[PDB]
Curated annotation (Swiss-Prot), chains A, B, C, D, E, F:
Keywords recorded for this protein, A-Z: Glycosyltransferase, Transferase
Species for this entry: Aliivibrio fischeri (strain ATCC 700601 / ES114)
Gene: deoD3
EC number: 2.4.2.1
Subunit (UniProt): Homohexamer; trimer of homodimers.
Lineage, opening ranks: Bacteria, Pseudomonadati, Pseudomonadota, Gammaproteobacteria, Vibrionales
Entry's Gene Ontology cellular component terms: cytosol
Active-site feature positions: 211 (proton donor)
SUPFAM superfamilies: Purine and uridine phosphorylases (SSF53167)
PANTHER family reported for this sequence: FI09636P-RELATED, URIDINE PHOSPHORYLASE
Protein name per UniProt: Purine nucleoside phosphorylase DeoD-type
Transferase recorded as keyword: yes
Length: 244, 244, 244, 244, 244, 244
C-alpha cells in the first residue's frame, strides 16, 4: 500500500496518521509553534509546506495537534478541507484575535463565537446564493463556556464578522455591524464553521479582543502574550473534555 | 399621560403593560390559545388584531405570554419588532415545527436551532448585502439543552433553513441544504434571531420534526399533539429558569 | 373516491368544492368575515385553519368567496398557491390598504395596481435572478376602471411597491420609490400577481390609501370603514361582470 | 435667447419645437422613415444623428412624430431620455416585433404589453437593487385594446421579456419565461416603460409576433409588411384619441 | 448551394464573402461611411440593415472593412456576434470616443484600452455571476502602442468603464471609477472584448477623449474631426501589420 | 522622528527603507527565500512576521526584493496594501503557478496575465457591485513579452481566473471558464492587479502551468524546479529594464 503509505496533500506534508483527533489553529504558524513548544509534551513538527507549520504532541495524556491556517477564508479553507478529509481530524478550535467595534466590548474580552457573519462570496457560490448560517458545534461551545465559568476571564458568547478585507476606507460598516450585534471583526471563523458543516466535523472559535477599532486602542505586545495564555489554557481544557 | 395610557401598535391591541418578560410564540394563533388555556393560570387574552391572538398568564408563579406570529419572515418580523420595542418583551421562545430533509433526522426529533440559514433578502437589505449569521442567545440555548437532558426527547442542536417558499418545484435544493448540515426547513427562525439581534433581545427556537420531506412521511394529528406537549413542557421549564 | 372526497390542504380545511370561481382577499381574516357577513347572502364559513377565515356566499345571484391571506409575500403566496391549484379558484381581487409616499397621492385615493415592484427575493429565486414584471390581468383591471368611472371615488391606476419590511430606519427609500412613480407601499400585491402568472389565474388588486407615510397623516377608524365600503362595492361590481 | 434657439442633444439634431406630443418608435430608423412617408402628411425629417432618423408630420389633423430608438435598452434609453426631457414629448408608442416562446402564442398575434420583465441591470442600479415593475400607462393600454376590439387582429394583452441578449446558447430560459406567462421576447419595452416612469411620461408598446422561437417558424418578408400595416393603423388610431 | 449562396444574418445583409479579416468599428454608421469614403480605395457598401452601414475596401493593398455597431452593449454585441461567426471576421478595432473623469486625463488623449470594467449584467448571466475580465488581444494592443510611439499623439494605455447608462443623477460613481484607475467612460468596449473572448477573435479599442465629464469641457466639432483623423491613421497602420 | 524611525505594519516587521522599488512575489514564503538566496547578492531578510518571509538584495547592480504573499485574495491583498502604501514599493511581479483547464494549454506553458477574472466579492464591495476589470500595467506586460521573445519558453498572453476556491465539487465551471478564454486558474492575480489600480502601482503576473486540471496531469517536483528557474530568469530580466 505505497500510494497510501506516502499519501499527503498539496499544502500539508504529514503522513496520514500524523494528526490528533483535535486541533488548535491560530492564523500564525509561528504562534502554532510557540503553543506546541510551550504546552505540549513529546512534540513532533508534522508539516511545514509553505512555512505553514503544524505539530502533534500530548497534553495530560491526550494527543493534541496545533497548526497555522493563514489569513483569510480562502487560505484557511484549504487547510480545513485537507485536515477534515485526508487527515481525518474531527475537532477544531480556532484560537484567534479580533477587533472590537463598540465600547461595550472591551480589550481583553474573550469572544466565544456562536456564529460568524461574512462578506465572502464563497458560501453563496456553494449554497445557491442563499444565506448560509455558519455556526459552532453546540457541545464544543458549551464546553468552552463551562471551562470559562471556572476562570476570571471576561468572556462574551455571540457573533463575529469574518471579512475578506483587513483595510477599509472608513468605520461606517463597522457601526452597522455593531448595530446588529456583532462583537468583533476577524477573517476565518465563518470559513471554519462552514467547512466543518460540509465535512461533518466539530468546530468552535475563541477570539481575544486584542484591538478596539472604534476606540482606537490596542493591547501591548506583553498584554497579547498574557491573553494568549488565558485562551490556550481554556482551549486545552476543552480539548481534554471531548470524547475519544 | 393619555397618549401613553392608550398606546398600542398597528398589529397589537394590548395595553403597554400587558405582556410578560418572556413569550412563547408558535406560528398559529389558535395553537397560542390552546397553549395558554392548557398550561397557564389566570389567563387574559391581551390582543386579537387580525385574529393574531396573544395571551398572558402565570406558570409556577412566573408571568408568561404566548402569542402567534403568523407565517413567514415578513409577518413574524412585524410582531417581533412591536413586541421587542413598544411592549418591551425581552425573551422569546419560538415553538415551531419543521420538515426534515435527510433520513438521519427522524420524525419526532426536536431541533434546538443554534442558527438559521435563509433565502429571504431582508437581512441583505439591512446589512449591506453581507451574510448575516442569525443565531440563538447562548444562555437560552444552553437552558434548552439542560432541560432536554432530563427528558426522553430525541433532540438535535444545529441549524435550520428559514424559507420564504413553502412550495418548490422539486427536492434538489433540499438535498443541497442537507449536504451542508441543515436539519430541517421552516419559515420564521431566521427572522426571530435577526430581530432579536437588532433589538438586544434574547431568543431561541425549538422545532418539532413533524414532517419528513425527503422520506415522504408525516406525523398523525394525534402524534402532533403528543410532540407539542413535549415541546411546551420544555419551553416552560426554560422560561422558569431565566432571570427576572 | 374517499381520498378526493376528504382532500384539503395544510393551510385550508375546506372541502374541494367549497370556493367560488372568484375570491376577494384582504390581509385580515376578521375583515374577510366582516365582508362576508355584511355583503353576502347564504354565507358559509368554509375554512379556519390558523384563524385564516374564509367564506363562500352569493351576491346578486353569483357565488363569491372572501378569505384572508395574512401579511407578507410568504404568507400570502401559500394561500394563493393552494387556492389556485387544489381549490381551482380562477379570479382573485386583493382588497388591501397602502401607505402613500408623495403629496400628489391623497388619503382616500383608491389605487388600482397595474403592477407591483418588490424587495422580495422570491421571484429572483424562481426566475433565474431576472426582473419579473408582476402585473394585473387586463380584463379585470379594465373592469375595475369601468366600475370606478361610475363613482365619485378618487382613483389612480399605477404601480405599488410590495415590501417584506413594514418597519424601516428612515424615509430615504420611500423618496426613491416616489421618484420612479410608485403610488403606495404595501406587502402582498407582487405575490398575488406572480402566483397568478404561474398558475394561469386572473388577478387584480385595489389598495385604499389609508395612511400617508410622507405627510404623517392617517385615516381615522371611521374613515377606514367608509373607504372599505367604497372598495367592496367596486370589487363586488367587478366580480359580477366576470365570465362564468 | 440663442442658447435655447440652437439647443439640441448629443444624439438628436432637431430644434426644440420639432416633435409632436406623441411619438411612434420602432427600433429601425428605416422603418420610421417608411412609416412617416407612408402614413403622415406634410412630413419633415427633424433628426438624423448617427442615422437615427426621426420625423414629424400630421395624421387626420393631429401632429405625430415617428423615430427609431435602436437596439437594446442602453440605446433606446438614450433617445427616450432626450425626447422626454429636452424635447418634451409626452406620449410614446413603441411599435415593435417579438419572438414567441410557446405554441399558445401564434405568428401574427399582436402583443399589447402590460408589463416587461428583463435581464438588464439598469433598473437595479437606479432602484437600490429592488425589482422595478415596468408597466404601461393604463389609458394608453385601454385605448389600444378599444381600437383592437374594432379589428380582426388576434391580440393578447400581457407581459413581454426585454433581454440584453439576442443570442443565447439554448432555449432553457425561454421555457422558464413561458412557464411564468411571458408572451414574447424583445429588447426595449422595459426601458421605455422605465424611462416613462422616471419622467412622468405616458407609454405603451405593441409587439407583432414575427417569429416563433420555440416552433422555429418565421413570417415571410411580405407577411411582416402586412402585420406592420395592421400595427400602424392601430397605433395611429390610438394617437388620435389621446388628449391634447 | 443556394442556402449558403444567399446566407446572411438578421441584422446584416451582406453576402458571406463580403468582409475583410479586419474591421474598424465606430458606434456611428455615418462615421463608418465617412471613414470608408475618406481612407479606403475601391469601396463597396456591403450592408445597410437598419441603417447600420458597413463597407469593405482596400488600404495600401490590404482588404479592410468599416462598420457601425450602434450604442450600447446589447446593440454592439449583436453585430460582433454576427461578424465573428457567420462572416468569419477575425480582427476588430473599435474606434470610439470616451469621457474623462479626472483632471490627469486630458481632452485629445487617446486611450488604448487594456481592459474594460462594466455595469452590464450580460457577462454575469453567461459566466455564473463571476467577474469576467474583458481584455484586449495582446498582439493588437502592442501594435497600437508601437504605432503610437511613432506619433505626437498623447496616449494612455489602461482601463475604460463601459456603462449601460449615458445619463446619471450625479458624478459620485465617476469619482469612484477614477479612484480605481478608470481613464474614461464609454459603452461598448467591454462587449467587444467579451464577444472576442467567446469567439476566439482578436480585439482592441481606441477611444479619443472627446469630453471631460469632471472638468465640464468638450472638444469642438472641428477638434473632433482632427482627433478622428489621428485615430484612423493609427488604426489603419495597425491593421496593415496584422498577419494574413 | 522616532515614530517614523520605528514605523512598520501589523504584518511586516521591516524598517521603512528596507524594500526595493521592485518586488517579486510568489505565494510561498519558502520559495521567496529560495529565490533570494539563489539569485540575489548581498541578501538581507527584512521581514518574517507570521513566517511571511521577505528579502532585499541586488541583481546586476539593481536593488530587488522578493517576498511571499500567502494564499488567496484576502491574504495577498493585505501584503500588497502594506507594501504599496507604507513601504512605497512601486513595481510588482507575481511569480505564480496555475492549473490549465483545456488541452490547448500545455504543462510548462508560461502564462503572462493581461487580466484576471474572479469569484471574489472584494471588488464588488469596493466598486458598487460593478464588474471591475483587473488588468496588468502595459509597460510591464510588454517587457515580459519582449524578454520572452528572446527565450525558448512556450508562453501565452491572456487571462487567468483567480478563485477563492481551491477545492470544487466538479469540473463544470472549469469548462465554462475555458469556453470564454480563461487560460489557467490560480488565486491572487486579480487581487494584485486590483490593489495596484487602487494604489497607482505597476503590476504584472507570470504563472507557470504546473498542473493540468482537465487532463489530470502534473509536473514532477524536478520539472517544477526547472520551470521556476525559467520564470525567475524572465522576471529578473524585466525588473532590470524598469525605470528607476
Amino acid at each position: 500500500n505505497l500510494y497510501f503509505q506516502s499519501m499527503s496533500t498539496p499544502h500539508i506534508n504529514a503522513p496520514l496518521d500524523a494528526f490528533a483527533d483535535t486541533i488548535l489553529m491560530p492564523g500564525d504558524p509561528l504562534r502554532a509553534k510557540l503553543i506546541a513548544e510551550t504546552y505540549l509534551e513529546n512534540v513532533v513538527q508534522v508539516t511545514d509546506v509553505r512555512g505553514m507549520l503544524g505539530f502533534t504532541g500530548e497534553f495530560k495524556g491526550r494527543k493534541i495537534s496545533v497548526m497555522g491556517h493563514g489569513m483569510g477564508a480562502p487560505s484557511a479553507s484549504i487547510y480545513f478541507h485537507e485536515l477534515m478529509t485526508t487527515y481525518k481530524v474531527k475537532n477544531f478550535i480556532r484560537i484567534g484575535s479580533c477587533g472590537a467595534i463598540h465600547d461595550d466590548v472591551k480589550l481583553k474580552d474573550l469572544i466565544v463565537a456562536i456564529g460568524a457573519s461574512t462578506d465572502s462570496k464563497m458560501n453563496r457560490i456553494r449554497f445557491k446564493d442563499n444565506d448560509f448560517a455558519a455556526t459552532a458545534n453546540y457541545n464544543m461551545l458549551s464546553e468552552c463556556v463551562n471551562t470559562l465559568k471556572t476562570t476570571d476571564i471576561n468572556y462574551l458568547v455571540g457573533n463575529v464578522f469574518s471579512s475578506d478585507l483587513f483595510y477599509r476606507p472608513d468605520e461606517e460598516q463597522y457601526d452597522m455591524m455593531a448595530r446588529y450585534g456583532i462583537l468583533g471583526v476577524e477573517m476565518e471563523v465563518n470559513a471554519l464553521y462552514s467547512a466543518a458543516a460540509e465535512n461533518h466535523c466539530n468546530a468552535v472559535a475563541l477570539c481575544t479582543v486584542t484591538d478596539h477599532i472604534k476606540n482606537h486602542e490596542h493591547l501591548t505586545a506583553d498584554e497579547r502574550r498574557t491573553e494568549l495564555h488565558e485562551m490556550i489554557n481554556v482551549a486545552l481544557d476543552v480539548a481534554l473534555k471531548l470524547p475519544t
